[PDB]
Design a protein around this motif. Structure first.
Motif, PDB file in Angstrom:
ATOM      1  N   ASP D   1       0.846  -1.187   0.000  1.00  0.00           N
ATOM      2  CA  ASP D   1       0.000   0.000   0.000  1.00  0.00           C
ATOM      3  C   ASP D   1       0.885   1.243   0.000  1.00  0.00           C
ATOM      4  O   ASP D   1       1.908   1.271   0.674  1.00  0.00           O
ATOM      5  N   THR D   2       0.498   2.265  -0.760  1.00  0.00           N
ATOM      6  CA  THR D   2       1.281   3.498  -0.845  1.00  0.00           C
ATOM      7  C   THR D   2       1.413   4.216   0.488  1.00  0.00           C
ATOM      8  O   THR D   2       2.340   4.998   0.685  1.00  0.00           O
ATOM      9  N   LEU D   3       0.478   3.964   1.397  1.00  0.00           N
ATOM     10  CA  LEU D   3       0.510   4.593   2.708  1.00  0.00           C
ATOM     11  C   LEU D   3       1.475   3.791   3.568  1.00  0.00           C
ATOM     12  O   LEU D   3       2.272   4.353   4.315  1.00  0.00           O
ATOM     13  N   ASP D   4       1.401   2.467   3.459  1.00  0.00           N
ATOM     14  CA  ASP D   4       2.287   1.608   4.227  1.00  0.00           C
ATOM     15  C   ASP D   4       3.694   2.058   3.947  1.00  0.00           C
ATOM     16  O   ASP D   4       4.442   2.406   4.860  1.00  0.00           O
ATOM     17  N   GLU D   5       4.054   2.061   2.669  1.00  0.00           N
ATOM     18  CA  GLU D   5       5.387   2.462   2.255  1.00  0.00           C
ATOM     19  C   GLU D   5       5.810   3.805   2.842  1.00  0.00           C
ATOM     20  O   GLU D   5       6.955   3.972   3.271  1.00  0.00           O
ATOM     21  N   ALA D   6       4.891   4.764   2.859  1.00  0.00           N
ATOM     22  CA  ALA D   6       5.202   6.074   3.402  1.00  0.00           C
ATOM     23  C   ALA D   6       5.349   5.948   4.906  1.00  0.00           C
ATOM     24  O   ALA D   6       6.148   6.646   5.536  1.00  0.00           O
ATOM     25  N   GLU D   7       4.566   5.041   5.471  1.00  0.00           N
ATOM     26  CA  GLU D   7       4.591   4.787   6.897  1.00  0.00           C
ATOM     27  C   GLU D   7       5.984   4.233   7.226  1.00  0.00           C
ATOM     28  O   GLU D   7       6.527   4.481   8.297  1.00  0.00           O
ATOM     29  N   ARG D   8       6.562   3.505   6.277  1.00  0.00           N
ATOM     30  CA  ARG D   8       7.888   2.922   6.455  1.00  0.00           C
ATOM     31  C   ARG D   8       8.967   3.999   6.421  1.00  0.00           C
ATOM     32  O   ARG D   8       9.851   4.041   7.285  1.00  0.00           O
ATOM     33  N   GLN D   9       8.904   4.864   5.415  1.00  0.00           N
ATOM     34  CA  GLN D   9       9.864   5.952   5.307  1.00  0.00           C
ATOM     35  C   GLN D   9       9.822   6.791   6.570  1.00  0.00           C
ATOM     36  O   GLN D   9      10.864   7.230   7.044  1.00  0.00           O
ATOM     37  N   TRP D  10       8.616   7.025   7.101  1.00  0.00           N
ATOM     38  CA  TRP D  10       8.436   7.821   8.321  1.00  0.00           C
ATOM     39  C   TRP D  10       9.106   7.155   9.508  1.00  0.00           C
ATOM     40  O   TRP D  10       9.786   7.813  10.295  1.00  0.00           O
ATOM     41  N   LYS D  11       8.882   5.851   9.646  1.00  0.00           N
ATOM     42  CA  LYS D  11       9.461   5.085  10.736  1.00  0.00           C
ATOM     43  C   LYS D  11      10.970   5.221  10.685  1.00  0.00           C
ATOM     44  O   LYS D  11      11.603   5.460  11.702  1.00  0.00           O
ATOM     45  N   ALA D  12      11.534   5.087   9.489  1.00  0.00           N
ATOM     46  CA  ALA D  12      12.984   5.209   9.285  1.00  0.00           C
ATOM     47  C   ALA D  12      13.491   6.542   9.787  1.00  0.00           C
ATOM     48  O   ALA D  12      14.462   6.594  10.533  1.00  0.00           O
TER      49      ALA D  12
END
Lengths: 15, 31, 26, 32, 32
Positions: D1-12
């Protein structure tokens, strides 16, 4: 004197 | 909900930050 | 969320000014 | 999901931010 | 949509933030 703390943490993506 | 967690965690980090922000400010004024 | 992300936009500003005032005296 | 991925970048970036905070408070407590 | 718009504005602000992070990290390491 050292630099202020890093900037406020950015908000989680919501969309 | 993951989305709700992120928001929660995000909000949780503010107190400490603001606190370092204020402590640095003070120390800054003196010097 | 907005309100919290509105206070934030404002805290970033405050932070920014703390840096402006930092690099200055330095 | 495009949000998941962004959620990942954020976590990083979130993790890197905590590190900046750890190093920063330390350096700070030492200066006082 | 308002969401595509939200996605756009978030990605933009994030990356802009990530750049103040790098700039701050830089000033921080130099101070030491």
């Amino acid at each position: 004197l050292l630099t202020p703390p890093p900037p406020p943490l950015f908000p989680p993506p919501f969309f | 909900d993951t989305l709700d967690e992120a928001e929660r965690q995000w909000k949780a980090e503010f107190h400490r930050w603001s606190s370092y922000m204020v402590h640095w400010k003070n120390q800054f004024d003196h010097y």
